[PDB]
Amino acid sequence: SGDYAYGWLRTETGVHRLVRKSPFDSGGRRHTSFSSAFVYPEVDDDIDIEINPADLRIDVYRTSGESAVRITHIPTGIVTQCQNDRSQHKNKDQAMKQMKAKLYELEMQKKNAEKQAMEDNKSDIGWGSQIRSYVLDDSRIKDLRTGVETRNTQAVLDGSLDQFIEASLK
Amino acid sequence: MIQEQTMLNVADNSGARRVMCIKVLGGSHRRYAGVGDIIKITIKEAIPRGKVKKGDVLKAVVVRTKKGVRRPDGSVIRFDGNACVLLNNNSEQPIGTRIFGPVTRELRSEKFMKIISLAPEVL
RNA sequence: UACCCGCAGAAGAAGCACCGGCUAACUCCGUGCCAGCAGCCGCGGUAAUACGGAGGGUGCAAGCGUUAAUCGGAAUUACUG
RNA sequence: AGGAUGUUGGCUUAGAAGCAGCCAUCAUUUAAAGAAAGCGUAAUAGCUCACUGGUCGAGUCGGCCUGCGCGGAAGAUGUA
RNA sequence: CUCAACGGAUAAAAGGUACUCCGGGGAUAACAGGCUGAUACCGCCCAAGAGUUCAUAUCGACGGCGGUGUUUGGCACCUCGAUGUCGGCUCAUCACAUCCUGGGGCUGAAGUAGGUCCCAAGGGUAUGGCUGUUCGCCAUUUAAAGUGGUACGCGAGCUGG
RNA sequence: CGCCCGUGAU
RNA sequence: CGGUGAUUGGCGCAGCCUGGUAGCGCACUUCGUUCGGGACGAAGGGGUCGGAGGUUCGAAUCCUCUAUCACCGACCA
Ligand SMILES: [K+]
Ligand SMILES: [K+]
Ligand SMILES: [K+]
Ligand SMILES: [K+]
Ligand SMILES: [K+]
Ligand SMILES: [K+]
Ligand SMILES: [K+]
Ligand SMILES: [K+]
Ligand SMILES: [K+]
Ligand SMILES: [K+]
Ligand SMILES: [K+]
Ligand SMILES: [K+]
Ligand SMILES: [K+]
Ligand SMILES: [K+]
Ligand SMILES: [K+]
Ligand SMILES: [K+]
Ligand SMILES: [K+]
Ligand SMILES: [K+]
Ligand SMILES: [Mg+2]
Ligand SMILES: [Mg+2]
Ligand SMILES: [Mg+2]
Ligand SMILES: [Mg+2]
Ligand SMILES: [Mg+2]
Ligand SMILES: [Mg+2]
Ligand SMILES: [Mg+2]
Ligand SMILES: [Mg+2]
Ligand SMILES: [Mg+2]
Ligand SMILES: [Mg+2]
Ligand SMILES: [Mg+2]
Ligand SMILES: [Mg+2]
Ligand SMILES: [Mg+2]
Ligand SMILES: [Mg+2]
Ligand SMILES: [Mg+2]
Ligand SMILES: [Mg+2]
Ligand SMILES: [Mg+2]
Ligand SMILES: [Mg+2]
Ligand SMILES: [Mg+2]
Ligand SMILES: [Mg+2]
Ligand SMILES: [Mg+2]
Ligand SMILES: [Mg+2]
Ligand SMILES: [Mg+2]
Ligand SMILES: [Mg+2]
């Protein structure tokens, strides 16, 4: 939470590679590990759009089995029926709220699809998809994207990211 | 005197062998199509490597009927079966390159001079 | 025409693949599990004879390599065996 | 007939000169004239208006209370 | 004596009937008519805005006023000594709130093609697949495939899904 | 009597 | 639509009858044990009761209205 936070952090998304003498390896061997940072902004989540009767067409007809209603949307062209109760007003009310649900879920389904789309766009946290290397053996850091070197790893690991953010902000 | 559900043979070599009439074009409540009349067809059987596939919806022009055409002096020309030539759906131009069997002089019009030239015999 | 004679002048006439082991022939620089190599084993993760260039070598030579396809090696269908 | 001047008043916009919108809104000359009520232009330009003279020679203007009318006013056997 | 069903029938008692039956009731429902018109549909009033500017070409919020009888209803006036039900077929007939054809005004109307409103009822106004369907979706047409009233027209005219 | 597990560098 | 019962700690549940004190399992936190993890052992913390308004000296508890969820019925023509 801050002012212009996403602007500063949006350049960190990607996979970070670490080379280091493993402490979890019994043989004390040199291993490589990966983890991923993904930054996305907060959204206003406006789905407050509601039913405007200017663009609703309603039909009442005789039940299949004039109590049955058939509501349809003028621009979207998605229909709704109800034959629950013998009073059409009960049916007429139930469909538009069901119609409201139907409008609403398209918006949700539309947003659900784009989230899976960016899930597919994310790189795997594995060999080759790195954007920064943090090889702590010889105490070298290399942003292989810009590409800015550094020989002071401890400072970077504590929050000296001012070296990389500005250059990554092409 | 072709109407809906009538099965027609195919006079060209588009690939089709049998077509069914599904509409007589050119007027409201129109019953019959004679020689020279455009119809909407669907293909009911084709040869294995033709230009048209079974199930297609196309246009056609009737070129032989066994009801016949009546000439100005009172004569009649009847054939032994009904036949049509497949047309493109939009340009209404022939799809095939050959015509089999005789055709008649009621096709002598600006639209079907392509068919008249190809016909082995015009009556 | 083949051949023969006369003229002038070093003048018009050299590349391709390899160099870790098998397999003949090695060092420097650049890169840093990347880029790339690779027939098999395998090389590259900051001092690489294995990647790329340079110097030097080695093998063939108006050709030299790669790919495809057959037999050999394969005694790995064995009659010999 | 005339209906001006500083002044494209300030800001952003590309433009804001009257007009996308924002804050306001003085002076000069006669007689009257605006940081503009209206149409048009992208902005112009332009065409109005408000305003004042000359002609003309009797009334004229728009509010209030009231009487009676007009529109709003489409259906199925036949005026109905 | 929660005889509380509280002027308390017995000390002591639950259900099915589409297999049904009788006496009655339009005193009382279901269908259609009637009255009404909340709802529905059609129209109009004000105009915040949208339309580059520009409320009113075209839309029109927050609110308001009517018409029709036309959907879903309210009521219980007719009919229970009977007023046969949905759809299809056949045959229709009227209204106009006009789908096409005809005549016009404005257009954010160059032309072709449109949008919207006014006048106009002479004639015209699809065939199939699915489903008992009316409806609807779909295929392919047409100048167009109008919206309603008529016991949701029509079984002493047919059918009977 | 009961005792599960030990990623990946070459 | 009516009608009958539920909302309590991060999750699953008691407590309400019959007003004065919220409890349990898992989870969480610390310590111990082990080379380390799990299991195990010893300590410890966290909830004002869906919301709102009433009655009462006092409300998780009683009453009324709401929101969400669950069950049930919607029957003759
Ligand atoms: K042998
Ligand atoms: K009693
Ligand atoms: K009984
Ligand atoms: K029974
Ligand atoms: K009836
Ligand atoms: K009335
Ligand atoms: K009106
Ligand atoms: K009314
Ligand atoms: K009756
Ligand atoms: K009719
Ligand atoms: K009329
Ligand atoms: K017309
Ligand atoms: K017009
Ligand atoms: K007419
Ligand atoms: K249906
Ligand atoms: K009958
Ligand atoms: K009937
Ligand atoms: K009768
Ligand atoms: Mg090196
Ligand atoms: Mg080698
Ligand atoms: Mg052999
Ligand atoms: Mg009349
Ligand atoms: Mg009593
Ligand atoms: Mg009886
Ligand atoms: Mg009565
Ligand atoms: Mg009814
Ligand atoms: Mg009734
Ligand atoms: Mg009435
Ligand atoms: Mg506007
Ligand atoms: Mg009624
Ligand atoms: Mg009474
Ligand atoms: Mg009656
Ligand atoms: Mg009688
Ligand atoms: Mg009219
Ligand atoms: Mg059927
Ligand atoms: Mg009827
Ligand atoms: Mg009758
Ligand atoms: Mg039968
Ligand atoms: Mg039956
Ligand atoms: Mg495990
Ligand atoms: Mg192991
Ligand atoms: Mg309270």
UniProtKB/Swiss-Prot annotation, chain A:
Task: Output the superkingdom of the source species.
Answer: Bacteria
State any GO BP term from the record. Answer: viral translational frameshifting
The protein's location, in the record's own words, is: Cytoplasm
- Post-translation: what modifications? Methylated by PrmC. Methylation increases the termination efficiency of RF2. Is absent when the factor is overproduced.
Q: Which UniProt keywords apply?
A: Cytoplasm, Methylation, Protein biosynthesis
Keyword Nucleus on entry: no
Keyword DNA damage set for record: no
Per the record, GO CC terms? cytosol
GO molecular function terms noted in the UniProt entry = translation release factor activity, codon specific
Q: What else is known?
A: This provides a mechanism for the protein to regulate its own production.
As for family, the record states: Belongs to the prokaryotic/mitochondrial release factor family.
Role played? Peptide chain release factor 2 directs the termination of translation in response to the peptide chain termination codons UGA and UAA. Acts as a peptidyl-tRNA hydrolase. In the presence of truncated mRNA in the 70S ribosome, ArfA and RF2 interact such that the GGQ peptide hydrolysis motif of RF2 rises into the peptidyl-transferase center (PTC) and releases the ribosome. Recruited by ArfA to rescue stalled ribosomes in the absence of a normal stop codon. A TnaC-stalled ribosome binds RF2, but the active GGQ motif is prevented from engaging with the PTC by TnaC.
What quaternary arrangement does the UniProt entry report?
Answer: Interacts with the ribosome. Recruited to stalled ribosomes by ArfA, in the presence of truncated mRNA, ArfA influences RF2 conformation so RF2 can hydrolyze the peptidyl-tRNA bond. Biotinylated tnaC mRNA can be detected in a stalled 70S ribosome-RF2-TnaC-tRNA(Pro) complex.
Q: What is this protein called?
A: Peptide chain release factor RF2
User: Which species?
Assistant: Escherichia coli (strain K12)
Lineage per the UniProt record: Bacteria, Pseudomonadati, Pseudomonadota, Gammaproteobacteria, Enterobacterales
Swiss-Prot record, chain B:
Q: Which SMART domains match?
A: Ribosomal_L14
GO process annotations (BP): cytoplasmic translation
Gene3D superfamilies reported in the protein's UniProt record: Ribosomal protein L14
Q: Which domain of life is it from?
A: Bacteria
Checking CDD domains in the record gives:
Ribosomal_uL14 (cd00337)
Tell me the GO molecular function terms.
large ribosomal subunit rRNA binding; structural constituent of ribosome
Q: Which InterPro entries match?
A: Ribosomal_uL14, Ribosomal_uL14_bac-type, Ribosomal_uL14_CS, Ribosomal_uL14_sf
Instruction: Name the UniProt key words of this record, in alphabetical order.
Output: Ribonucleoprotein, Ribosomal protein, RNA-binding, rRNA-binding
The consequence of residue 117 to A is: No change in RsfS binding
Cellular component GO terms held in the UniProt record: cytoplasm; cytosol; cytosolic large ribosomal subunit
Task: Write down the SUPFAM superfamilies for this protein, in alphabetical order.
Answer: Ribosomal protein L14
UniProt-listed PANTHER family: 50S/60S RIBOSOMAL PROTEIN L14/L23, LARGE RIBOSOMAL SUBUNIT PROTEIN UL14M
Q: Subunit structure of this entry?
A: Part of the 50S ribosomal subunit. Forms a cluster with proteins L3 and L19. Forms two bridges to the 30S subunit in the 70S ribosome, contacting the 16S rRNA. In pre-50S ribosomal subunits interacts with RsfS, which may inhibit association with the 30S subunit.
What does the UniProt record say this protein does?
Binds to 23S rRNA. Forms part of two intersubunit bridges in the 70S ribosome.
UniProt record similarity statement: Belongs to the universal ribosomal protein uL14 family.
UniProt protein name: Large ribosomal subunit protein uL14
Species this protein is from: Escherichia coli (strain K12)
State which gene encodes it: rplN
